Design a protein around this ligand. Structure first.
Ligand SMILES: [Zn+2]
Ligand SMILES: [Zn+2]
Ligand SMILES: [Zn+2]
Ligand SMILES: [Zn+2]
Lengths: 103, 66
DNA sequence: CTGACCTGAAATGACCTG
DNA sequence: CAGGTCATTCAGGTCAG
């Protein structure tokens, strides 16, 4: 763990099974969550360079690179699992009623 | 540890093992589900790589006796 | 839209109990 | 060394720039 396997920037640990930076992590998550890939279209031949500086220049090449290295699209929670998580966190915040139950 | 590379906290269940593979196996069979390797049960279980694959680590547990 | 930074569940693995 | 703790160590959401 140290450098992002997709663009070479500093990484923040494992994300979707790969050592990546917050940049590639966020991009991947949002592409899967909103199914944005189909609209991604390289404007040349899919050979664009993806490095810590050029990563935002071609969305399709950046996503095809995330797939190639092995980022797990299945670790991006579907709507039922995402909503269940928010539900859990919100209702857990019921520590409030207990705080006031102490005294 | 007969599983990873880490030292053994003595014997547990089916063999001498670390508290990592100990806790891991302690939890596994209790709240049990079914791990599934993302690869091909090749995942080398060692100190620095043990948490990467729960399939291989679990099979590795019962494999070496546990 | 991006990504540096955040919140908190959940898993791991240290360290005690008898 | 079966037994429990339970402080510590990767998801989705946020919003300025
Ligand atoms: Zn990156
Ligand atoms: Zn391109
Ligand atoms: Zn071990
Ligand atoms: Zn495996």
């Amino acid at each position: 763990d140290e450098l992002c396997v997709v663009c070479g920037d500093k990484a923040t640990g494992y994300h979707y099974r790969c050592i990546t930076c917050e940049g590639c992590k966020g991009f991947f998550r949002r592409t899967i969550q909103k199914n944005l890939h189909p609209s991604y279209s390289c404007k040349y031949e899919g050979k664009c360079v993806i490095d810590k500086v050029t990563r935002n220049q071609c969305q399709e090449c950046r996503f095809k690179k995330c797939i190639y290295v092995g980022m797990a699209t299945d670790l991006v929670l579907d709507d039922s699992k995402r909503l269940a998580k928010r539900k859990l966190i919100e209702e857990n915040r019921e520590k409030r009623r207990r705080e006031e139950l102490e005294k | 540890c007969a599983i990873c590379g880490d030292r053994s906290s003595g014997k547990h269940y089916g063999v001498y093992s670390c508290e990592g593979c100990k806790g891991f196996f302690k939890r596994t069979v209790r709240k049990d589900l079914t791990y599934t390797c993302r690869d091909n049960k090749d995942c080398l279980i060692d100190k620095r790589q043990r948490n990467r694959c729960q399939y291989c680590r679990y099979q590795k547990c019962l494999a070496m006796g546990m």
